[PDB]
Amino acid sequence: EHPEFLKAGKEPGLQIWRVEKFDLVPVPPNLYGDFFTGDAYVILKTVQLLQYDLHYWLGNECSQDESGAAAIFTVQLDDYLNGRAVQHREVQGFESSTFSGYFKSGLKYKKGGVASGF
């Protein structure tokens, strides 16, 4: 459980969080599709038939605390959804077509990111 867990998967749509110093922080919706190469993200796609696909996205320059937190948060959100979510690891530049398909404008990357929690 967690404030952002409470919000997760309630309506069809796309929810994107960024790992920020060992926490799961919602990404400003105006930035959806633009991923900081130095950061890691958790993405929940909800479809109404509710089916859940969880993706964790790892930037090429993200730190071990961020990629590790992203993987753990993914497990924990899956558990919160009673394990019904399918988990997907997404590596910068090698993302699944499904993941790229979530973004009308395609995937784009930006230099930098939030600092490591280490």
């Binding site: 459980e1 060992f22 071990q64 590790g68 937190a69 993987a71 993914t74 497990v75 988990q87």
Partner: protein, 356 residues
């Protein structure tokens, strides 16, 4: 507020504070008693007057009085942290017996009065530290090796494999084959020297048979090492014959399968629909996976064993020596970790069974 992270290794305890990128305390898992006790390095400096025991054998606690001395040493001598004022994350070996988990929980809550604690499987912490929820972890430490398949965050118990062969066997095998050159390392202190020689000079051959031949044709295989007394020792094909035992345990008199075969067998135990994700995510963990050449060699050998349609990827993280500890440090730092730990109040009113 700030949790402590303790990885209970057969060879070394790794301890530190949640949020650090590495354990700030690493010491041998040794207890020495006269002819009051001493732990870690202090015990090695007092060999003559102490009897040295290893309370963790092959990853399992077997001497609980000595293990309590190790934990006391961790909190009071290394960390200088009050255990009764910090939550504690402790690691355990894959397939740790129920009774051991319950006993460790009892000792933490009733001898050390920890306010909260959590027990995590070492291999799972390593997979997390690699940024993955699915994969197979090959964790080779000092006293035990395990292959642990993990799917969407959770190990698959029915497919875990234990392999007694690990780093201490390799140190002892190097002690043995060095007699071919005339060296007689046998004492406890000499074994520590040989361990260091192993770590500095050994490597894993891509093809063992070919390496034996190329090494025979010149002296380039030979490399030196300065002993503490100042004399120089030279080591040739022992450099890669020693870790070769990981792949051919017969070198040690053991009938066991090598690490390549064991990983393969562990993947086969999992249903065919998730094997691709394990083959593609073979994650190395622990000090005995630090040999140069291991990923390339393991990739070749598992590719030979596995169906030709599978994509073999062996991942060798540069920090993998402490990835178990790093995984525990990340996990116990998350905003969601508060809800995961067992409190002393919960324990006091439920019992050591609450750990499950």
């Amino acid at each position: 507020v700030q949790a402590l992270v303790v990885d209970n290794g057969s060879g070394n305890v790794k301890a530190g504070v949640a949020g650090d990128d590495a354990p700030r305390s690493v010491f041998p898992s040794i207890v020495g008693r006269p002819k009051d006790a001493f732990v870690g390095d202090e015990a090695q400096t007092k060999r003559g007057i102490l009897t040295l025991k290893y309370p963790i054998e092959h990853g399992i606690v077997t001497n609980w009085d000595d293990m309590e001395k190790i934990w006391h040493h961790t909190f009071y001598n290394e960390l200088r942290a009050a255990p009764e004022e910090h939550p504690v994350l402790l690691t355990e070996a894959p397939l740790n017996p129920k009774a051991n988990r319950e006993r460790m929980t009892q000792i933490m809550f009733e001898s050390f009065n920890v306010p909260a604690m959590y027990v995590a499987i070492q291999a799972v912490l390593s997979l997390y530290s690699s940024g993955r929820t699915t994969g197979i972890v090959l964790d080779s430490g000092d006293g035990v090796s395990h292959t642990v398949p993990i799917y969407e965050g959770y190990a698959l118990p029915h497919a875990i494999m234990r392999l007694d062969l690990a780093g201490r066997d390799l140190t002892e095998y190097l002690m043995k084959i060095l007699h071919e050159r005339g060296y007689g390392f046998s004492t406890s202190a000499e074994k520590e020297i040989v361990r260091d020689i192993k770590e500095k000079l050994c490597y894993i051959a891509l093809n063992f048979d070919e390496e034996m031949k190329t090494s025979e044709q010149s002296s380039d295989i030979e490399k030196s090492y300065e002993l503490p007394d100042g004399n120089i020792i030279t080591v040739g094909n022992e450099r890669f014959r020693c870790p070769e035992a990981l792949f051919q345990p017969s070198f040690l008199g053991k009938e066991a399968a090598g690490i390549h075969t064991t990983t393969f067998n562990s993947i086969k135990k999992c249903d065919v629909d998730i094997r691709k994700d394990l083959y593609g995510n073979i994650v190395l963990s622990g000090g005995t996976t630090m040999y140069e050449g291991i990923g390339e060699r393991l990739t070749r050998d598992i590719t030979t064993l596995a169906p030709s349609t599978m994509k073999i990827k062996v991942v060798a993280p540069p920090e993998r020596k402490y990835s178990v500890w790093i995984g525990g440090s990340i996990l116990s730092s998350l905003s969601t970790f508060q809800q995961m730990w067992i409190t002393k109040e919960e324990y006091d009113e439920s019992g050591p069974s609450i750990v499950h």
